[PDB]
Design a protein around this nucleic acid. Sequence first.
DNA 1: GTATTATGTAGTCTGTTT
DNA 2: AAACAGACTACATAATAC
Lengths: 52, 51
Amino acid sequence: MYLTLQEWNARQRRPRSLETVRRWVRESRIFPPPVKDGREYLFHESAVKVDL
Amino acid sequence: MYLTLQEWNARQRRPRSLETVRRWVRESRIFPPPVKDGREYLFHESAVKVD
DNA sequence: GTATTATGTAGTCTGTTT
DNA sequence: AAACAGACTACATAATAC
């Protein structure tokens, strides 16, 4: 299922500050790009961080 | 058998610049610490970087 | 060495959910 | 309204790159 930004962060090898994760999203570092459902990002469970 | 700094670095989950790996060695971040043998560092196969 | 990039905390801004 | 989520910026330091 979709994860919240904090829930996706908590499953990564090195969780970061939520502001950091948000910056990754703004910078197109997350594949697939999270959808903003209303006020919050939804991450695919299989979303990964990529180097651009 | 020992590995070279380049060989060790290519085998990690995120290889870094040589400069950075050398700095980690200089800062004793790597265990077991590499042996300096002549001009090269020699890494144990099991050597990991401790955070 | 110096410069650039990555990260962190805060305040204020737009907008969403209750 | 009030709490929430996130954007954007100002301000920092650390790690990495040059």
